[PDB]
Amino acid sequence: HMALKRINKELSDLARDPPAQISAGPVGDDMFHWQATIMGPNDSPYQGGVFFLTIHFPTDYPFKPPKVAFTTRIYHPNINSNGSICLDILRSQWSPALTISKVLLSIASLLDDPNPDDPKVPEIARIYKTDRDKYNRISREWTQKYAM
Amino acid sequence: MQIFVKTLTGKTITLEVEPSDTIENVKAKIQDKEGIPPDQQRLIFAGKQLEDGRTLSDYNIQKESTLHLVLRLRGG
Amino acid sequence: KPHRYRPGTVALREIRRYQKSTELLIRKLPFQRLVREIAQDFKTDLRFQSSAVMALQEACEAYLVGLFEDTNLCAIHAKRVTIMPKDIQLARRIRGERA
Amino acid sequence: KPHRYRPGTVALREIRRYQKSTELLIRKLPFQRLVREIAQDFKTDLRFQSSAVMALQEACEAYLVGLFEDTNLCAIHAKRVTIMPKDIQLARRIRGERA
Amino acid sequence: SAKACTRSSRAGLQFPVGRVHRLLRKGNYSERVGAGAPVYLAAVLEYLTAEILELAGNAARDNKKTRIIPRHLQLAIRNDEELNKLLGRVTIAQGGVLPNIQAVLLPKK
Amino acid sequence: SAKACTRSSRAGLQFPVGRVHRLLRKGNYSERVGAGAPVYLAAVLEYLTAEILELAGNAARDNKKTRIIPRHLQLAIRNDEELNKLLGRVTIAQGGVLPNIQAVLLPK
Amino acid sequence: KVLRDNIQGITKPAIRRLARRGGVKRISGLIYEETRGVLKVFLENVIRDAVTYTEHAKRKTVTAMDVVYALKRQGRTLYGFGG
Amino acid sequence: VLRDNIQGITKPAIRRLARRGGVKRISGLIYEETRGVLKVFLENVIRDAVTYTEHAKRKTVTAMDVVYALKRQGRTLYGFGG
Amino acid sequence: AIPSLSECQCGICMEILVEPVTLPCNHTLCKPCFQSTVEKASLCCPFCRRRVSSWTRYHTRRNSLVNVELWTIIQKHYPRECKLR
Amino acid sequence: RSRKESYSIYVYKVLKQVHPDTGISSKAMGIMNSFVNDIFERIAGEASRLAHYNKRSTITSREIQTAVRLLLPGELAKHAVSEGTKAVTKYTS
Amino acid sequence: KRSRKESYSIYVYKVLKQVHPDTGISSKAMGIMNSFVNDIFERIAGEASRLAHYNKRSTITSREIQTAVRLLLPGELAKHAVSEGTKAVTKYTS
DNA sequence: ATCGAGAATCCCGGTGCCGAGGCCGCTCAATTGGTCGTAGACAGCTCTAGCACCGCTTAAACGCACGTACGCGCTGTCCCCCGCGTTTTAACCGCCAAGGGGATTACTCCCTAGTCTCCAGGCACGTGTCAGATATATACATCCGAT
DNA sequence: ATCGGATGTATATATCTGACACGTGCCTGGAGACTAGGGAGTAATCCCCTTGGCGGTTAAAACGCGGGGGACAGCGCGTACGTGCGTTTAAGCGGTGCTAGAGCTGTCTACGACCAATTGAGCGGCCTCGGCACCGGGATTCTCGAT
Ligand SMILES: [Zn+2]
Ligand SMILES: [Zn+2]
Questions:
Q1: What is the CA radius of gyration of chain G?
Q2: Residue A147 to residues A77, B1, C75: CA-CA distances in angstroms?
Q3: Residue positions of the PTM N6-propionyllysine (chain H)?
């Protein structure tokens, strides 16, 4: 199919130019299914924690975004308990020129600085807004108890 | 069979191994060549976590593959 | 020797006759064929009730009669007696049908 | 001896200037007095919000501009360049406002 | 009224009141329908109907007939002034037009 | 779409879906209102608003202004082929008229 | 089963009769083409809405009620055919 | 009492309106006819506006009534609410 | 002057571009990509991300979407790409 | 079979009340049905809109009165308003 | 205080920012846009109501809105609006 | 074909002000959850009329010839809007002041939807008969060439 | 100003036929009685805004005059269109056959209405600074009398 060649280009680009702190690939024989791992940036309270997530590619691609969901738990206002994520690139402003590598870089930038505009989990959002230290050590506790 | 692995510090190190090597053998070689304790090392290939029980050939690994290393610091 | 009316009188007789009757002035079969052709252009494989064709014919004839009356008024405004395509164009422009 | 423009060449200037701006072309108080007069004719002792007066003025302005544009179109069609009342009656006749 | 006869008869009308009431209620015009509205509406409908019927009957009697045909209705509507304004944009099937010719078109005397 | 987010964001729109639903339900249009109607209606409304606003902004930029005024709205609406047809009988307050001088009237 | 140039079925005498009904004495030699174009435009503008109405209701046959509804929506009410 | 106010629409106003409409040369009998047709339009709109005000048991014809009368007549107006 | 084969490929398909369409932002795309991104995407140029709905509607009515010069250059100098499909 | 509803016998009764001698053909009768439906729909729609105008929720008599006053021209409006007022006054007792 | 009044001002402003990043808009234009939105919505809803009554139904389904859009608007605007509505409802369903 | 003087219009720079955009507090309508009566989606059946074809009239359409009257260009006359200058008038702006009625709230009461039961008014179908359409034969109004 | 043909139109009489007015079975919507509660009528209060008035200043309205361009009437030309006749064409009417699709009925399941707790999106009010309005000076460009 037409999307198959574009995915071939994506996988070739990922192989020849692996990203830094993110690594992704097909867990199974089926090419549409995908999975990824992201390591927290150095300038973040997520040191030593790895986040694993799964992606489902629609049969009609690249004009429609794929479904991305974490399998691991973490303390973050945009990250839901079940792994639900809210980002404008993901659903609002998805474009054909966008690449999976680009959205992974956007996710890494989100990890660098949480988005306080429309967080998915707002209680921890106002907890973070109350003071930085509370969010810091609760994130450290979460990433050392489950993500590690 | 030469491969490359990059760590969190941005340095790439060279590993001369064979596809039949166990993951525990790989971690032992990494510890020997770096001094890092094995318990602080986590190995990821294309998002797939590596377990010491299995081997390299179980992931369909070809030549000059680039890997990622994660430091599991015991304490934070 | 043959007797022929002055040019224009039998036209007035026709005007007086046709404003007295109420039948339809377009042959039914060609109009039905035209309607079916337009419909098949829009959506293929359609069927028409007879009453729908009759209603379309009545609407078209009423609209054309009104347009011709207004066109004649516009042409008479220009100190003329005939009707010309620019008269039709102006009568349609003023009504806002084409603009 | 003093500079005088050829007759008509300043009317085009007024047309160009007035088709670019959007201010109201009729003074406020006379229009308000006329509106109050007509309303008092319908119902006695009525009070008017200023916004209502402004809205009425806007509607009347648009209607008059449109009618004059159509009248000028008719006058051009009549092989002339001036508008006379019969043009207005013809334009209002074709639009169906009087019949 | 007597509150004993049929509603249409009680109101002294001929057009229905129950049917108009149902049409107002079920027609999705408002959540509630007052108890006096259908009487008013039926009266207005009957008055307009009687007006048009009387003009049509006079026009038919003029043409020496005993039945109102569409041409008679068309003549009755157009000849009158107010009814022409009320039905300005309508088209009557098999109607025809009023007989008129512009004065310019008539032959020179 | 995934739940736990506002209805307007589920479809990617910006117009208020719930408000349109309330207006349809309480406006005496039908006894029952489907659950897919308000989304479609909001989509159409938002598309039309965006389409008119693009042309209005383009005209305002062409007039060396950075604030849209009703004159720019009239210039955008009347210079478009389809929008003029749709808004045939609508009078924009303080909108003026298009610049148009008949060919015959010009000096020779 | 396509159809070709059926507008030629609108004969010159038919348009002449229509003009006579409208109250026209003298007709030029070019009115016929313009009238044919106008008639085409009118039929397209009405048939579009008629077909839309008869398609929304999951029917394959247009009915007189559809035509009168399309005419009423367009702005020319028609009496004498129901509705 | 108010009387003889239709002359408030002075000749320059009508000339300006024709100039906006795209009129080059104006005759001398246009002004009276324009005043008459304007009076017709005002009467026809004000009747509906005042009727709408009557129905609401009110005493001031607010701009909403004028807007809605214009909408009823087929001359929809924007910018004043609605 | 003549564009090379490497730059002649579609900016999205990663393959040869057929029936070029040029946008106001001067972006060239093939008709499949353009039509599909009109009818199931955000309806904007994927490269610059600005609305093109007005231009698209304007140029679809009169069939002014295609650019003749680039299409004919590609067809004449690169014909067997078209022969492929 | 599914029956159709129409104002036929009612219009016929009105005609016999006005002109005792004349009859009415079928096509004109359908024309009259359509006219009655048209006037009813116009009046009711205007009344419903006007009722919604004032933040009400019910259509009472004066609503129909104002709708009739708005729609019909002068003399017809006055006569119809008088007829309706008389009818409702006769009905209320 | 005055009773709360409803308007489309904020959504129109959001759309304007989405289209033109650096263009303001006066209050009169806000009033005009709000009236335009109200007028178009009322037209479409009334057409859909009449159409759904004409088939002896009781529910206004998205099909009625689609047919009303296909009726009111001119050709090209109708096609674009239908495409936009179908895309929106398809995204909303899943 | 042109040159130039006078007059209107567009550019640019500086100054100022008020309204549009952002922020805060708040209250109420959208949200989510759960339950339940019913609208219509689907399968099935019946049977109406819409389509297709064929044959026979004959009425309407077509092509052509001839003449004439009407459209169109041209000329001449005259008279009436136009452009400009001067004088009068009232529109517009800012200011103050008063109270009328629009807008809101609290209270109460009675008008109408909803349910059940029951029954007769209108609808579908069938039948008789005369109003009107048709054919035929006279009587009169009207037109056109010619005195 | 007629006068005689010659034409078309109007008018009086027989007839026959199919559509209208009426009679009848019946069943589905309309009428009658009773209940609940919320929508609307009514009284009271507040304060916004509409009406009213005064003074200035000045841009806009009113008036007069010279004249040049445009409206309008008259003449001549020839070409396009009206009018009539013979010929060709397909519309119109009848009769028959077939079935695709309109219309009606029975099941039942999923979609939408209703109600309660709740909370965050959206609105009212404040404030501020920049975009636009305004003024003065200069550069640019149509315009017309004169060659
Ligand atoms: Zn492509
Ligand atoms: Zn671009």
A1: 16
A2: 17, 33, 89
A3: 11, 24, 57, 59, 71
Q: Which of F31, F23, E31 is nearest to J59 (CA)?
A: E31
* Interface residue I38 vs chain K (CB under 8 A): yes
| Contact assessment for residue E10 and residue J91, using Cβ atoms and an 8 Å cutoff | yes
> What method did the depositors use to determine the structure?
cryo-EM
Q: Are the beta carbons of E102 and C72 separated by less than 8 Å?
A: yes
Pair of tokens at residue H78? 């924007």
Resolution in angstroms, to 1 decimal, for this deposition?
4.0
Give every CB contact of residue A2 below 8 A, 6+ residues apart in sequence: I13
Rounded CA separation A125/K29 (Å): 37
In sequence order, what DSSP letters do the residues of F58-94 get, joined into one string? Answer: HHHHHTT-SEE-HHHHHHHHHTSHHHHHHTTTPBPTT
Q: Please tell me the distance between residue A98's alpha carbon and the centre of ligand 2 in angstroms.
A: 14
Provide the CATH number for the domain formed by K9-93 in this structure: 1.10.20.10
Interface of I with F in 47-66 (CB under 8 A): 51, 53-54, 57, 61
Say how far residue E100 (Cα) sits from the centre of its chain. Answer: 25
Lookup result for tokens 């349109």:
F20
Cβ atoms within 10 Å, residue H23? 24
Amino acid, single-letter form, for residue J33:
N
Using DSSP's 3-state secondary structure scheme, residue F95 falls into: coil
- Give the Cα separation of B64 and B48 in Å (integer): 18
Query: How far apart (Å, rounded) are the C-alpha atoms in residues K8 and A75?
Result: 37
Q: How far apart are CA I45 and CA I25, in angstroms?
A: 8
Task: Answer whether E97's CB lies under 8 Å from C19's CB.
Answer: yes
Place of tokens 């709708």: J67
CATH number 3.40.1010.20 is the correct assignment for the domain at B2-71: no
Handedness of CA G30, G32, G37, G42 (dihedral sign): positive
> CA of J69: how far to CAs of F50, H47, J47, K2, in Å?
41, 10, 11, 34
Q: Going by C-beta distance under 8 Å and a sequence separation of 6 or more, which residues neighbour residue A46?
A: A40, A74, A111, A139, A143, A147
CA gap A86, F12 in Å, rounded = 12
Q: How far is the CA of I28 from the centre of ligand 1 (A)?
A: 9
Q: For tokens 């006569």, what's the residue?
A: J79
Give catalytic status of residue A48 as yes or no.
no
CATH classification number, E7-97, choose in 2.20.25.530, 1.10.20.10, 3.40.190.10, 3.20.20.450: 1.10.20.10
DSSP state of I51: B
Strand E32-33 vs strand J58-59: parallel, antiparallel, or unpaired? Answer: parallel
